[PDB]
Structure formats: structure tokens, C-alpha cells
Write a protein that binds this ligand. Sequence first.
Ligand SMILES: CC(=O)N[C@H]1[C@H](O[C@H]2C[C@@H](C(=O)NCCS(=O)(=O)O)[NH2+][C@@H]2CO)O[C@H](CO)[C@@H](OS(=O)(=O)O)[C@@H]1O
Length: 618
Amino acid sequence: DSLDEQRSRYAQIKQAWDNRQMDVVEQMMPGLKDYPLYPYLEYRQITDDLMNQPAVTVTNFVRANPTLPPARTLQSRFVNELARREDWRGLLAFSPEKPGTTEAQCNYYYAKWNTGQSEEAWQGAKELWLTGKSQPNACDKLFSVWRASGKQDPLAYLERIRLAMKAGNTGLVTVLAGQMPADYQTIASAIISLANNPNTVLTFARTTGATDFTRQMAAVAFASVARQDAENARLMIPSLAQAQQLNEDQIQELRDIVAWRLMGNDVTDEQAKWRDDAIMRSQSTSLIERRVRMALGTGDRRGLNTWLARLPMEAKEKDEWRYWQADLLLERGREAEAKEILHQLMQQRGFYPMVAAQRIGEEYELKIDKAPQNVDSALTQGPEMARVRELMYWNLDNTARSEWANLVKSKSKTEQAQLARYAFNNQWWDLSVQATIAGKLWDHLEERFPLAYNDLFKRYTSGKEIPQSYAMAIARQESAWNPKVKSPVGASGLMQIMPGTATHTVKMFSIPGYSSPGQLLDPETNINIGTSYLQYVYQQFGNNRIFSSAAYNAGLGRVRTWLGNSAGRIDAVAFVESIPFSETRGYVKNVLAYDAYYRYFMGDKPTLMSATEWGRRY
Ligand SMILES: CC(=O)N[C@H]1[C@H](O[C@H]2C[C@@H](C(=O)NCCS(=O)(=O)O)[NH2+][C@@H]2CO)O[C@H](CO)[C@@H](OS(=O)(=O)O)[C@@H]1O
């Protein structure tokens, strides 16, 4: 027998197992005893009839298999099965220490109360209760025997309504207030009203006693009315401060809540002066920084100077703010002072280090740390590394991921450097980037920006105007080179193409044979629909990589509105730095820099922005 024979029997046993030919599976499994991935086939057999599986069998799977990611999911999973069974004496014997999952922990503490360890159940119920996030259904039987025990503190109860309202969980607020501790039963209708309809907030304030609870409830509802109508909220602040005997620091916070809502170029000149007053009076670095960003995207050189200076000493240390202080200093004629700041920034890594070298006309120097010439045995020789080798062979990238996480996680910065290089050398490109992140090996440039899928980006950007490096830069940022990633909200694959976008792109460009979203997990299909959407977005924004990158992430239209606000008034960097969306702002900064490292590795000059990008006005 041999590893190659073992791979055909694995593929063949998975076919029969998926088609349910259990007689063939039965026959075939004991032979696969020595294949790296046999724990997975055992895990599959066990989870296949879990409802009538004995604790002995599950306990021995877990016991022999400590480094294996699905063994841990089985603990938390069999705990809930013993809970379904109502075997509370079996659950504690199986899982003596709390499990990792929230459903599992709820069940584990309800088991403690059923086996007489009550004060342990209440240490668990209290810590599962202090949260405005809705908990598992499992947990509802814990919290009722707790509450019924008289051991539930009435403040622990009000604090969960305080946490639920802050978290936007207006539903948990209504159930919570719905069956309430008799000590607070007079404010229970007011709290349901406020959560339902926030505009009632002044009535809440002017009705209930002003305690710190009622003030925090009224503050969160207030934040909601400023979002519906900023003028309503602005004028409501004197009555609210009165009704609740609000201290000055409390009143400054109501002003910041409204100030945030008056940041457009559609607020009345009365609103603008009110706003800037509140902001000049604020202890909030974020509100002041949004304000600097407003001076920047409007070309206001005086507001920039004024507001930049109001930033806390700590904030002024940030690369962008260090760059816009040297920007203003250069206007005022203070050349040496300013070029000291741009030469120091040029010693660091990233967007502003590169913008600075470009701005004063010097060559940016890339610092690339050499990765070790030896990746010795122990790492490279284990059990877990053999499961990783196989999982990658079968393109099981997200499973390979979880196995690599455990493996790189407790080694020294040198072995994590060897592990990156090893993966780099077997062309496991997403595993190279992961070991780099994990081991924070930030100046190991080769292993962080590997030239992945070169011939396919080559091919699919040959009849297109978008440079190849800019295409690999988008993929690098989107998925960090994992073919099978799927975002929270549906974005799939190598270039993280939304389904709705894949549909419209295959229609505009008349692309053949793309029937379903799952095809977005194929490298070549994803690179074809994706480079097609990126060339579409590039050409309608005049071949400018600032506009095409923010357009691919947020869409065409949001970018078109941002071009409407600045209106020809500002420069490239100030257009980037003033994008009102944190994700898209961060996005353009990484795609522009990453594009410079792929150009460098492809042999061309790693300059951050083209002459037509740098000279245009925005
Ligand atoms: C390539 C692609 O599909 N791009 C789409 C983009 O995806 C973004 C969405 C984002 C995403 O999934 N972000 C994470 C969301 S979360 O924080 O994890 O919840 N990444 C994707 C590609 O970069 O979302 C915007 C918004 O509609 C779309 O613009 S619009 O259709 O014209 O309005 C745009 O077409």
C-alpha cells in the first residue's frame, strides 16, 4: 500500500458515502486506517448517527484526537445531545469542565443545577445573562430556574435591559420589560414604549425618576432620534438635560450624538456653527477626526489647520495626521520642518510611507526580511502537517485553514517564519499569508504577497486595460488568497464577487456557462467574472485606480456621490483620506500599496500613484 493508493480509496469512499452506499463504506474504511485524514471519516461516521451514539465512543474519539479541529466541535455538540437526552449525570461526566460553545455552556450549567451544584449554576447563569445579545434557546431553562430560585439580583436584570438597548436589541428589551422584577414594575410600560418608538424619549425622561439607568436608556433612545431627525434632537437637548438633571459631561455627549449627524454639505449655516461649537468642546478623538476629514474633502486649508491642532497628542502620532501636519507646514514655507516629518514616515511600511516618498520626490525603499534557508523536520515532519498536506491536495482550503491555525499558533517567530516559507514553497498560497499574519511577520514580503494564480491573471487580463498587478492586488486584499472564502454578507471567492454582481457582470459582458453562485469558488471562474467587473469599474472612472478600487468595494454610485462633494477642489491623497466610509478608506489604502509590492516582484518600478492619478484634481 502507499499514500497514492490511499488517495484513490479516499476519493472513492467519499463518493459511495455521499450516494449512501453504506455496504461499500463499511468494506472500505479499515483499509484507510493509515491515511492522514482517517479521523475525518471516523468523525463523519459518529456524527452520522449521533442521536444513538454512546458517550464511550465519543469520549474515545476525542481522547485519541486532541490536535484535530472537529474533535472539539464534537465535545460541544455531544454535550447538547446528552442535554436532549436529559442525561444530566452523563453530560458532566463527558464534559466535566465548561464547553467552548454558548449553547453548550447553557446546558452544562443547567446540568449542574439538576445534579445539586446550584451556586455553580448561578455563577454560570449570571455570566451568560450580562449581555444584550440574544442567547441560545438552551439558555432559557437556566435563566428560569435561576430567577425562580430568588438568587437573581434585580440589578443584574435592569443591566441586561441597559445592555440590550445599547446593542439595538429592542426585542430582548420588550420581553425583558414584559415580565419584570416587581421592585421596578412602575417603569415597565415606559421602557417598552421607548424601545418600540424612541421619539417618546422626552416623556420617558419627564415621567420616570432620573437614575443612571433611566439616563442611559434615554441617551440610547436620543441617539436614535438624532438619526431620524438631527434638528429634532438638537432642539430637544435643553429639555432632556432639565428633566434628568444632567451633568455637563452628560450634556456634552448629547451634543456629540447630534454633531455626528450634521457633518454633510446640506446643513444650515445655523447648524454648522452649532455643530462646530459642540465639536470644539468635545473630548472625542473620533468626532474631531471626522471633522478633520470634512476639512480635507472640501479643500478647506484653514479648517484643516484649526481642526488638526485640536487632535489629542496621541492622535497626532498617527501616520495620516503626521502627513497632513507636514502638508500644512510645506504651504507655510517651513520646508525643513516638514521634510523631516516626510523622511521619518518614509522609514515605515505602507500607504503614507509611500505617499511621502512620492511627495518629496525620493525613491521609497522596500524592507524585505529574508525567510530562513532551513525549514527543519519537527514542524515539517508531524502528524498535523500530513493532514494539512492532504487537505490542500483535495482543495479543502477552509479545513486546511483550521488545521494550520493550531499548527502555527504556539511556535517562535523563527518557526512561524520557517512554516511560512514551507507553505510558500509548496504553493499553498493562502497558508503562506496566514502564517505571516499569525506570526506578525510584516516585512517578510514574499510570503505575504505571493504571486498566486499567475498564468490565470495573465490570461484573464491580457485583453483588458487593467494591469495584472492591480488585479492580484484586489484578490490579495479581498481573500488573502483563499479560493473558498465566503464573506458574512454573501461575497464569494478569490475576488469576493457578490452573487448579484456576478449575475449582472456575466450579462453585460456576455460570459458563457455560469449557472450558479457556487461556481464563484472555482479559481478560474472567479478570476474571469472578477477581472470583468474590475475592467468595467476601471474604464467608467477613466482608468483611475483610486476610483475603481473604492467602486469595486462600495459601488460605482457611492463613489460618484463622493466625487460630487469634493468637486475638483482637492488632491488624490486628500480624496482617499476623506472617504466617509472606514472600510472603503482602509481598502483603497491597502490595494494601492499592495499593487506597489506586486509590481516590485514583477520587476517594474514600485511607485504608489501614476502621474495622471497624482496630477488630477478630485
Ligand atoms: C465585486 C462585487 O461584487 N462588488 C460589490 C460590493 O461588494 C463588496 C461587499 C464587501 C463585503 O462583503 N464586505 C464585508 C461585509 S461584512 O463586514 O463582513 O459584513 N466586499 C465586496 C467586494 O469587495 O458591494 C457593493 C455594495 O452594493 C456593490 O456595489 S453595487 O452593486 O453597485 O451597489 C458591488 O457591486
